[PDB]
């Protein structure tokens, strides 16, 4: 079996576990040919690197030219979403904006959301380096920890990145974990990848790929996004609820063995029923995991109960 973190203390184990030759480094980066930018990025990641959990989260002066960035992401996905964005996404954007600084001249401090979120849901974040493996990254949720990135994509392409970035994590991610019952589901998808066999990590990957990044959910007669990757791409957020892609309604024995990359807009979307019923399903899905064991998240005591 596979060694998992069984308190939430135990989560510190990863920042010694990240690809330490990032996407940075590439030719084709959109910063690769600026030092000041690769300097930048080696900054948030020692940030990263010397977190222990429990302290606070240290806060970063953004730079103007980080500040105009986040600008242009903000205003322009922020003109999407009271039409596109699940319901539960809208109800929460304005208590971000107005308790955790949400707007267009001003980026977000970590500690501030994470403080926010902690009180919606317990859910907390932790700053991270670079990509971590699907079973370090997933296992942090079932702690109801969200590992979240503090730098921002290079200025010359406001409206891409090639890797989440701090935009993608507070319009994409933050705003659903702030929503009980996603942070349930989201929880559950970390539980059942503890101590799993990597094949079956990489399946509740691609569930989770299919979810939490490109979910689609059912509201009332309507469908609407809740995907952090579609909350925020701005191109891929309108042809998702378009008639271009095809959807099917989300079965795990398909889903998680279903093909996809990361390059283009999806071809195919799962329908989730709400995120109770997503969540029961990865709990069903998560009973055929072969594990010689069933586990359980005491929040009293912040430890993993294994049986
Ligand atoms: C999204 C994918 O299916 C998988 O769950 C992972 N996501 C992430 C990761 N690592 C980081 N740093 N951030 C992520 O959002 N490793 C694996
Ligand atoms: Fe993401």
């Given at each position: 079996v596979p060694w998992f973190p069984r308190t939430i203390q135990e989560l510190d184990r990863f920042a010694n576990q990240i690809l330490s030759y990032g996407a940075e480094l590439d030719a084709d980066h959109?910063?690769?040919?600026?030092?000041?930018?690769?300097?930048?990025?080696?900054?948030?990641?020692?940030?990263?690197?010397?977190?222990?959990?429990?302290?606070?989260?240290?806060?970063?002066?953004?730079?103007?030219?980080?500040?105009?960035?986040?600008?242009?992401?903000?205003?322009?996905?922020?003109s999407l979403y009271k039409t596109h964005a699940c319901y539960e996404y809208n109800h929460i954007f304005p208590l971000l904006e107005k308790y955790c600084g949400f707007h267009e001249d001003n980026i977000p401090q970590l500690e501030d959301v994470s403080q926010f979120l902690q009180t919606c849901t317990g859910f907390r974040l932790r700053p991270v380096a670079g990509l971590l493996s699907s079973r370090d990254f997933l296992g942090g949720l079932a702690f109801r920890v969200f590992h979240c990135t503090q730098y921002i994509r290079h200025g010359s392409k406001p409206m891409y990145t090639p890797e989440p970035?701090?935009?993608?994590?507070?319009?994409?991610?933050?705003?659903?974990?702030?929503?009980?019952?996603?942070?349930?589901?989201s929880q559950e998808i970390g539980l059942a990848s503890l101590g799993a066999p990597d094949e079956y990590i990489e399946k509740l990957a691609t569930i989770y790929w299919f979810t939490v990044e490109?979910?689609?959910?059912?509201?009332?007669?309507?469908?609407?996004?809740?995907?952090?990757?579609?909350?925020?791409?701005?191109?891929?957020?309108?042809?998702?609820?378009?008639?271009?892609?095809?959807?099917?309604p989300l079965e795990l024995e398909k889903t998680a063995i279903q093909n996809y990359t990361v390059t283009e807009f999806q071809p195919l979307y799962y329908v989730a029923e709400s995120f109770n019923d997503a969540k029961e399903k990865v709990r069903n899905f998560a009973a055929t995991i072969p594990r010689p064991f069933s586990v359980r998240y005491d929040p009293y005591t912040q430890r993993i109960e294994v049986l």
């Amino acid at each position: 079996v596979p060694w998992f973190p069984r308190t939430i203390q135990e989560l510190d184990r990863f920042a010694n576990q990240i690809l330490s030759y990032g996407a940075e480094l590439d030719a084709d980066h959109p910063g690769f040919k600026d030092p000041v930018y690769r300097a930048r990025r080696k900054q948030f990641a020692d940030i990263a690197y010397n977190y222990r959990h429990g302290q606070p989260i240290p806060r970063v002066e953004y730079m103007e030219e980080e500040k105009k960035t986040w600008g242009t992401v903000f205003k322009t996905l922020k003109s999407l979403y009271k039409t596109h964005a699940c319901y539960e996404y809208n109800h929460i954007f304005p208590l971000l904006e107005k308790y955790c600084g949400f707007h267009e001249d001003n980026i977000p401090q970590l500690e501030d959301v994470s403080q926010f979120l902690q009180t919606c849901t317990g859910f907390r974040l932790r700053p991270v380096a670079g990509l971590l493996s699907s079973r370090d990254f997933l296992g942090g949720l079932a702690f109801r920890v969200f590992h979240c990135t503090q730098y921002i994509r290079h200025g010359s392409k406001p409206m891409y990145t090639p890797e989440p970035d701090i935009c993608h994590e507070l319009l994409g991610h933050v705003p659903l974990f702030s929503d009980r019952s996603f942070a349930q589901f989201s929880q559950e998808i970390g539980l059942a990848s503890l101590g799993a066999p990597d094949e079956y990590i990489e399946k509740l990957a691609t569930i989770y790929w299919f979810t939490v990044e490109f979910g689609l959910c059912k509201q009332g007669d309507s469908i609407k996004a809740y995907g952090a990757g579609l909350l925020s791409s701005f191109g891929e957020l309108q042809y998702c609820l378009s008639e271009k892609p095809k959807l099917l309604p989300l079965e795990l024995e398909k889903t998680a063995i279903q093909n996809y990359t990361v390059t283009e807009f999806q071809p195919l979307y799962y329908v989730a029923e709400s995120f109770n019923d997503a969540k029961e399903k990865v709990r069903n899905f998560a009973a055929t995991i072969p594990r010689p064991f069933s586990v359980r998240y005491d929040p009293y005591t912040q430890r993993i109960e294994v049986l």
